[PDB]
Symmetry: C5
Subunit: 238 residues, 5 copies
Amino acid sequence: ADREKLLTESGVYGTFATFQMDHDWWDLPGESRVISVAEVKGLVEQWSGKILVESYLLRGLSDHADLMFRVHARTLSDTQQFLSAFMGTRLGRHLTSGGLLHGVSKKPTYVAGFPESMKTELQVNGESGSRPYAIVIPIKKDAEVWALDQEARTALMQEHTQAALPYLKTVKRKLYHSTGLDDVDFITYFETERLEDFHNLVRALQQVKEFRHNRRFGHPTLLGTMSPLDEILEKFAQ
Amino acid sequence: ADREKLLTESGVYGTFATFQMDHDWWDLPGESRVISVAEVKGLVEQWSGKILVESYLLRGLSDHADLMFRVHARTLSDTQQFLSAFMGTRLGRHLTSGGLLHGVSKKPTYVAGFPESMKTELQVNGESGSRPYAIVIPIKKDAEVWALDQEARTALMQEHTQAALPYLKTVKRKLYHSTGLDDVDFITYFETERLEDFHNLVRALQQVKEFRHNRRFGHPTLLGTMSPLDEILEKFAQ
Amino acid sequence: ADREKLLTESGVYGTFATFQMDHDWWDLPGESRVISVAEVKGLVEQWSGKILVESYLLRGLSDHADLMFRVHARTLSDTQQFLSAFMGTRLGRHLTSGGLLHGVSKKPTYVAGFPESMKTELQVNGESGSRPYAIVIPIKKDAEVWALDQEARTALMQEHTQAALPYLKTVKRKLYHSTGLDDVDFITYFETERLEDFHNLVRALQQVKEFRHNRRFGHPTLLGTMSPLDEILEKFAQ
Amino acid sequence: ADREKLLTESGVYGTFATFQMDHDWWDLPGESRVISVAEVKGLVEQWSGKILVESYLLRGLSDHADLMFRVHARTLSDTQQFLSAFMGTRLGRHLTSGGLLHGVSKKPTYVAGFPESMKTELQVNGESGSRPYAIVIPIKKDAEVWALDQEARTALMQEHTQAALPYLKTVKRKLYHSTGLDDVDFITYFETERLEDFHNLVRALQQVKEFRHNRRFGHPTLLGTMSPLDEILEKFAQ
Amino acid sequence: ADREKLLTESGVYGTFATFQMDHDWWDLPGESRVISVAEVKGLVEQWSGKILVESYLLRGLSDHADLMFRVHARTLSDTQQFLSAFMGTRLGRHLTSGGLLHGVSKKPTYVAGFPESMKTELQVNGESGSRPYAIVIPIKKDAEVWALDQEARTALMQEHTQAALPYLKTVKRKLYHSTGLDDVDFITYFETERLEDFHNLVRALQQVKEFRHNRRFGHPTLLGTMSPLDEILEKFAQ
Ligand code: HEM
Ligand code: HEM
Ligand code: HEM
Ligand code: HEM
Ligand code: HEM
């Protein structure tokens, strides 16, 4: 019900937590593991009131990463308590943190200066799909960029948006403002059913001016499949 | 009593030590951990005469980090003695050092050359708050910066303060001069109850001239919650 | 049967998975290992319907890497499901992931602008050989490159083809377009029976203009021997 | 007999493999160590037909390295099989691979354009010595260098050779061409009885123009003592 | 007796060895540990003819480092044997190698071209003190520096010496020429009783031209306390 309430509002913190599994985890009986999976499910259900948790399977698509959480919360204190509780489960005890990124969702600052045709088209964001591919790309801008004026940056983002137009429906997008909460300026997140499309999207965006100013682009580039927490957890219990 | 002499005086060394918990710590009985946690509590109280020790929960906010200490001492040999004992406890035996940074506090070198109105406001530094967020950011400047004359750097630093003024109350700050004691020139430390404020603070500072001259900014950016040592250790002993 | 249709078609995903073996793997009886190798072979034929899996021996030629897979699939979900199961085997359980790269094969975009003499020559691609050396070289182009026009980029690739012509026969080649699926823009793959030929090819390509615009070239440079799954597995069961 | 044929011919592959000893090696009885040592001692004798293996003591001179092999072979498949067999022994089982580099020996490409005086002096290469120091320095040249024409590059190498002339006898030298076989362009190898001579040589070579064009110089720089395999392993069985 | 001859003479090698203590060292009875302490003491006493061994406590001041040796020898092979022998002791069995650097002492090469006041002032080097702080800073110069002539570098080094004059007495200094023996050109070593003094020294040196030409400055900067081997080991025999 309130899953759409956090996924759209401004001032909401999004956290991306990556985890890897110790090898001696498979040296455990399938029954100890089945119990450990139930513990995790109960915990997220317990937190289903304060925070929203979506889970992704990174195992086999991203190196040194088996699982990712995307946590939405009004305060990172909530995220901290939940993540700390998660790593405390018997499943969590066997997990190695492989990355942690935070960012807050905001209302667009440049869209207001775009052509109205571009504004209205931007009201489209992805399309209905089951178990889509998900990509997360952390971004650090070089310092020279922040010297530019509001008009110039508005221009760069329109050039940016213009190249991305063909993918409004076929590629869902989300942006998190991350500067000061970690070592990057932005966290970018995308959903898609066709990876060949997303590839062309990033390839198209490489042709604009804005792209020349990335100190960090990827590193890591997280690639996974969006899946119910149930299905992912099952894969760890055989 | 003298807890405030260390947090405010000049010539006081601040050391930041971050720790990650080994997985085989969870292979220990809750009985041994409660005993091991008791060991650490006594040690800091034992050292409660010469140095000040503050603990932070980094687990769930920073990757590869569960705990951080901020230790203040008049001589770094004392800090050395304390940490060496801490890492010797059974809790310490299972901890992986994730970084160790030192810096000394000083009297401002540029503030004297600021406008007097700006001087007086700088006398404001944070506000009363309970269990605040804490951010630690190591900073390395590129070499050309040190070539500039004192007047130019005063100008850079004034532009720096000018952008930071709106956050004097909502963001407490402290600076440690670290060059020669490790691989960074400064350690920056901040407390806040509002991360979105601290975020906006760094965004404002990214727009000034001095910012263009950072060889290293972050790496790591430490984010945690300030908490009594008791509560932190508690979380690891169940 | 249809294995060359994937190795040649466009819209086919190529994934490169590298593995190192844990030391505690050899503390197992030679009897258990053979059983575990048995576990792996059944899996590849079980997936031999949905995906193509080729295996390479990297042990002794590449540092910190013992095994590599080259998986071709219609969808990366298939690769993920296979790989997630593979690392789940009792053999995989003792394997440390050393890298994962994805890329899609496409029809040439620049060749159409080549001389007819050069185009026809390009239809030659490697030659018949047994258990050839294999090389994988990930590539990231710098951002300034993507600003150039189609004509300029066409010229650079013609000059590129021109220098590589002598190796059409002695060096099999394949290119994967990877941008957005990981931290590189291209994955290049080669088969050859004479490493000094492939060497002369790469020193020759270093002489061209296009070569100066590689932010990342190698890292890692993967060198291994192409072998049936049967022969490689032998080496971990001794 | 053919011991000098491999160390002098062109078309010979030189591979450098460094190893470190695990701590759990000492948790074995002194007889278990002697059995593992005899196994390795025996294994090299077995490969003494196809390839030449020279052993170096890096323990105490290079960090995270106790042993280095220098293997010469007409084909790298032999080297792979040998190293893969070595890493399989119970001694090797306790070993951590610390680096692996390949390169081919060639006949000089620039010397032909040198003064007859330089050619004749270059016929000097080292001197008679027992258990000499050995240094390995991997080199990556930057892309601009390969853009240069053959005449200009010949001049750079002459200026290069000229500074090196005083050390022809007291420092043995060998060059391996490595491009495409790994992430570096050259592998350099040296023997000497007086390290301060070799030091002065490297300082002397730092003064020429060509030196400014190394993207990578060292990393790692390997320092060890040339010693029979016999004495090296002996040191591990007490 | 000759302890002062080695610490001052030219042609003497200084080696810096870092060690970290294994966790399983504390799982031994305090009595078993004491024998190892006598074992090492006996070992150093045995080498007291050929080499000088000084010990430092890095634990609690340097990250990933508990102990450091500074070994002086007329030949580097002897250092190899002692270190190779030392890491073999039951103390050595529990020690983890953490870094290794070598360098040779020389007669000053630039000082002769200084003003005589600067020459005479330079004969001051530290002061009598017990258990001083010690700092080690590895240095790699960028290639352009070595292109400069003897006169120009003399000018650079004078400017360097000039900024350092205030610290002649309060900071002892020593310089090792390291090129070719590892990945750095120089190893710098300092003793001081006042770290804030050494800090001000490095801040002062950052302002001269020479500082801008460091490819590598620090990484790591080692910080520890000079202490007798006996007292340090006792701390490990508790
Ligand atoms: C796929 C469809 C996309 C659309 C329609 C789109 C459009 C936009 C728009 C309108 C903004 C302005 C935000 C604002 O005004 O507050 C923006 C910002 C941004 N986008 Fe995209 N974008 C797309 C894809 C991407 C991709 C693939 C990336 C990176 C891989 C990306 C990275 C960014 C970044 C870093 C910003 C913030 C730039 C800044 O504040 O300087 N976007 N995008
Ligand atoms: C309310 C927030 C802040 C205020 C009011 C403030 C103000 C100042 C002032 C007045 C100085 C000069 C001190 C002197 O003259 O010795 C200074 C120094 C410095 N500040 Fe801040 N600052 C704030 C936050 C930050 C933040 C968030 C960072 C980095 C993330 C930062 C980085 C630095 C550094 C590295 C120096 C020393 C630079 C040098 O000495 O060359 N400051 N700050
Ligand atoms: C006999 C050997 C080779 C031949 C004949 C050859 C030829 C070609 C041709 C015809 C293309 C056209 C691509 C297109 O039209 O879309 C191409 C693209 C490309 N090749 Fe090669 N190549 C060879 C080896 C290599 C090697 C060794 C590398 C790198 C180590 C490499 C890197 C690339 C890259 C990155 C592209 C695409 C770059 C871009 O689209 O901007 N090639 N090559
Ligand atoms: C007595 C000492 C030395 C002598 C006599 C010497 C001489 C030479 C000669 C004659 C060549 C020409 C090779 C050719 O024409 O194919 C050469 C190339 C080369 N040397 Fe040395 N050298 C010495 C020391 C060193 C050292 C210490 C290094 C590095 C640490 C080094 C690195 C190289 C490299 C990388 C090349 C090939 C570069 C290229 O082909 O672009 N040399 N040297
Ligand atoms: C009181 C303290 C210091 C004094 C009096 C001093 C003075 C000098 C002098 C006179 C030289 C000339 C050596 C020669 O002629 O061969 C020298 C060399 C050098 N110094 Fe210092 N220095 C001090 C501290 C430092 C520090 C703290 C560093 C780095 C952290 C440093 C880095 C170097 C390096 C790398 C060289 C060798 C450069 C070369 O040979 O080209 N010095 N120093």
